[PDB]
Every structure is written in C-alpha cells, then in structure tokens.
C-alpha cells in the first residue's frame, strides 16, 4: 500500500494544525496528521498559526495525502499530511519547534520516523516549544 498526494484546494488556514479545504467541492476542515500545535491563546500558538497560514496561503499549490488508516476523525475532520509546493507542512512545523509529534496511531503513522527526526533536530537546537 502506497501513499499518494493529490491536488488540493485551500479555502483558508485555521490555526497551527487545521486548515479548511474545498474537498471534492465541499468545504471541510482538515487536521494535520501526527502533530500538535499549541492553541492560539497558548505560548507559540500565534507563531504556529502564522507559520502554517503563510506556508499554505502563499504556496503556488497545495496537496493532501491520506495515510493508510482512518481518513476522518471523530469530529468529522479529514486527517492528512498537507504539502505546500511539495514541502510537508506537518514536517516543517515540527522542524521549527512549532508543533510536537503527537496523536501517533498505528496504521496512520507512515511519516512518523521522518517527523521524529525533525523533532529531534528542533529539540537539539532548542527551538520555540523546546526553547530554554
């Protein structure tokens, strides 16, 4: 079983780890897989929100990639990896210490090792959430 990115259409960025897509012609919230950004009113929340917003809004295009397992969560949100001009937003947040690796469920964990490699680098550099 292989993962494949597909073309996506942005309506708007919502916060650090959620975006609104026009998915098959319906507005739908997507939650980024394997990451957790702070809430806007928590430390680094505004920064994570603005980093995801600039990355998706300013991209020439965005793509979504489901993993192998559940595609929608218990709140109806789609669960995907999101790419902006080919760069994974989920990884970039982690690499900048603006999200933690989190919500790792077996069966939607394809990019776990990639993301924990990014988090280890953000922790070594003491970035943001990991700053001292």
Q: Specify binding-site residues.
A: 17, 36-37
Per rule CB under 6 A, is residue 23 in the interface with ligand THP? no
Residue 39 annotated to the active site: yes
* Block residue for tokens 């070594």: 124
Query: Nearest approach, Cβ of 37 to Ca ion (angstroms)?
Result: 5
Q: Please give the span between the terminal C-alpha atoms of the chain, in angstroms, as a whole number.
A: 41
Per rule CB under 6 A, is residue 112 in the interface with ligand THP? no
Radius of gyration of the chain (CA): 14
Query: Nearest approach, Cβ of 25 to ligand THP (angstroms)?
Result: 24
DSSP, collapsed to helix, strand or coil, labels residue 16 as: coil
Annotated binding site for Ca(2+): 17, 36-37
Chain-centre distance of CA 100, in angstroms?
11
For residues 37 and 52, give the distance between their C-alpha atoms in angstroms, rounded to a whole number: 10
Which residues bind to ligand THP, rule: CB under 6 A?
A: 18, 31, 33, 36, 73-74, 79, 103, 105
Show which residues are catalytic. 31, 39, 77
């Amino acid at each position: 079983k292989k993962l494949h990115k597909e073309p996506a259409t942005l309506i708007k960025a919502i916060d650090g780890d959620t975006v609104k897509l026009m998915y098959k012609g319906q507005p739908m919230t997507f939650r980024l897989l394997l990451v957790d950004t702070p809430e806007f009113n928590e430390k680094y929340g505004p920064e994570a929100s603005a980093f995801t917003k600039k990355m998706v809004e300013n991209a020439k295009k965005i793509e979504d990639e489901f993993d192998k397992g559940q595609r929608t969560d218990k709140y109806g949100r789609g669960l995907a990896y999101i790419y902006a001009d080919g760069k994974m937003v989920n990884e970039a947040l982690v690499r900048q210490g603006l999200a933690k690796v989190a919500y790792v469920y077996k069966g939607n964990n394809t990019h776990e090792q990639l993301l924990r490699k990014a988090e280890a680098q953000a922790k070594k550099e003491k970035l943001n959430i990991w700053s001292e």
